[PDB]
Amino acid sequence: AHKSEVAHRFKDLGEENFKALVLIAFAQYLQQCPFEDHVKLVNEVTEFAKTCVADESAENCDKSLHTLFGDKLCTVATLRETYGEMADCCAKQEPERNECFLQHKDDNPNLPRLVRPEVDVMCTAFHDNEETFLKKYLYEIARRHPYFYAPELLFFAKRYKAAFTECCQAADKAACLLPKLDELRDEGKASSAKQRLKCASLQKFGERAFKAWAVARLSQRFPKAEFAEVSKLVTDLTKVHTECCHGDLLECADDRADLAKYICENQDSISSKLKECCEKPLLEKSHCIAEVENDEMPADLPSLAADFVESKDVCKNYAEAKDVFLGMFLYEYARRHPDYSVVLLLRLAKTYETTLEKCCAAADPHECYAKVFDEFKPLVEEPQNLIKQNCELFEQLGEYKFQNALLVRYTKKVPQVSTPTLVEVSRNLGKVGSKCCKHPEAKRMPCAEDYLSVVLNQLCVLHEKTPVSDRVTKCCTESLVNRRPCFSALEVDETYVPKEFNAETFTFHADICTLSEKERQIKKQTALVELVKHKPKATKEQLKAVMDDFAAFVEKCCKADDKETCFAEEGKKLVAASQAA
């Protein structure tokens, strides 16, 4: 809060990140808008920002960033002919207009896959106009990921630039470049989903659900830190994410840079793992600190039982600083439990809270909450067995067939869900094994259950766009923290009237041969979903057999002289034969 907010953020961030961040904001709020229209909007805004830096009294410089940005966006968005319902946001004044633009962010926009050009062509284009090339990178990611954590997209952008800078001078450009880009492509996806969970927690469940999340995760990460210090960080981190999820991207990046700075100057009070992170340059520093490994737990920590169970002033302490007290409980339990998922720790906290709510009213409170910690046992236990058992299945199957097993499992749980959503969610669910099952049973739950949190939230938000399954709605609506157990407890749905057998749904074209491996698997996993919708009584054994028939038949037809008269003819052989069998 300054006399000219646009001047203050252009000074704090510098021209280059200001520019980049304004493009991301525009690309995120108006996803269907072409690249050159955005570029032009960003350049007017930038040229204007410059006049405020020079005279913060100049006309309009005291407007709010949403007033300035939203007006600029509306010069193109107000065209209902091409933007349809976005034009409604433009008929509104702030802060309603901002709210409208937030509501219209599209988790799955109707946007073509990226035909990646040739290495020499990308390299030439990078050398032709460096700035435009990198801007296009920012645009294509921001419009497809409208909740991508914006300061962190700057960090991706920097690594994307460095990949080209380095690899376009290699003797073997492709060998150098493609691995870097593939790696960037997949970390950006993981990052966006992870950020998507932060914005959903904030927007659907409120500042308090996010603060709980952050007290737990940060107490695990920095267990040496005092409660006042963890609270301080949680306050600052909640403001950063609130800003970013609210489209206040310049503020978010600016407050994030301050957080990193604060952390790096107070390592002594925070953690001993931070030394490397705190020597990195500005963008990398923040990324590094958000993923640093947990610190060692201080030695010889007393029991929680003394302060939270045995003490004869639990009700006193609870009934006087309710949220401070429970925040202390969760801090103390999370700092001692790096091996529990954040969601489990929050379920434990919630069970502790509701016991107090119940016992502090009771005749003898002290006697009523004496056993509260035993109530934690079955809650700890359910996520461990799940993880154990599904890892076994992963070790047995491999990533792809584990994706197939989860695909059948989730299709049977919630068969009304669109097929594209079921494939994308299940595939991602399968990636939990490769990510988490190589770890010892003690790093597995935080890794695996916190990842499932991220994937189920994707299903939640892709389904809320057009709801069709009451079970998904219920599990997504009922309580963030129990989301994973809720979906895991779904049995097969017996209301579900099987989908009528379709011909064209099970017929592969010849263009399928020229797709990537991943794209071709998706075609197969699409088909497996539609088979389960059509025959939901089919056995795990009957299904892993028609998957193999589709597999071998696509290989056969793709490796053939008449690829057209094969997929037509020797494909009909695959359909009515697996229809009967």
258 carries a ligand binding annotation: yes
2 carries a ligand binding annotation: yes
Name the minimum Å distance from CB 563 to Cl ion. Answer: 26
- Give 282's contacts (C-beta < 8 A, 6+ positions apart): 257, 260
517 carries a ligand binding annotation: no
295 neighbors 223 (Cβ within 8 angstroms)? yes
246 carries a ligand binding annotation: yes
96 carries a ligand binding annotation: no
Name the minimum Å distance from CB 299 to Cl ion. Answer: 29
189 vs 499, beta carbon nearer Cl ion = 189
61 vs 454, beta carbon nearer Cl ion = 454
Name the minimum Å distance from CB 290 to Cl ion. Answer: 4
Residue of 132, 488, 507, 521 interacting with Cl ion (CB under 5 A): 488
290 vs 342, beta carbon nearer Cl ion = 290
Site residues for Cl ion, 286-325, by CB under 5 A, read 290
CA dihedral 281, 286, 288, 292 (to 10 degrees): 140
Q: Which two tokens stand for residue 241?
A: 């994410």
| Amino acid letter, 305 | A
Q: Which stretch binds Cl ion (CB under 5 A): 48-56, 300-308, 432-440, 486-494?
A: 486-494
4 vs 403, beta carbon nearer Cl ion = 403
How far is Cα of residue 147 from the mean position of the Cα atoms in its chain? Answer: 8
Whether cis (ω within 30° of 0) applies to the bond prior to 95 is yes
Name the minimum Å distance from CB 558 to Cl ion. Answer: 21
Does residue 503 sit in helix, strand or coil? Answer: coil
Question: For 308, which DSSP code?
Answer: I
Name the minimum Å distance from CB 10 to Cl ion. Answer: 24
Q: Which stretch binds Cl ion (CB under 5 A): 99-107, 356-364, 481-489, 531-539?
A: 481-489
- How far is the C-alpha of 57 from the C-alpha of 474, rounded, in Å? 52
For 257-296, the DSSP string reads HHHHHHHHHTGGGT-SS-TTGGGS-HHHHHHHHHHPPPPP
Name the minimum Å distance from CB 518 to Cl ion. Answer: 6
- Of 578, 581, 574, 547, the closest CA to residue 404 belongs to 547
- Of 275, 295, 386, the closest CA to residue 338 belongs to 295
Site residues for Cl ion, 193-212, by CB under 5 A, read none
Residues touching Cl ion: how many (CB under 5 A)? 2
- How far is the C-alpha of 564 from the C-alpha of 322, rounded, in Å? 70
183 carries a ligand binding annotation: no
328 vs 455, beta carbon nearer Cl ion = 455
Name the minimum Å distance from CB 434 to Cl ion. Answer: 12
Element (H or E) spanning 114, and its range? none
Which backbone phi and psi does 495 adopt, to 5 degrees? -60, -35
Question: For 301, which DSSP code?
Answer: P
254 carries a ligand binding annotation: yes
- Of 152, 240, 243, the closest CA to residue 189 belongs to 152
128 carries a ligand binding annotation: no
Question: For 500, which DSSP code?
Answer: P
Q: Which stretch binds Cl ion (CB under 5 A): 200-208, 282-290, 300-308, 324-332?
A: 282-290
473 vs 488, beta carbon nearer Cl ion = 488
> Tokens 């990842």 identify what position?
451
Which residues fall in the annotated binding site for Ca(2+)? 5, 12, 243, 248, 251, 254, 258
Which residues fall in the annotated binding site for Zn(2+)? 66, 246, 248
Residues forming the site for Cl ion (CB under 5 A): 290, 488
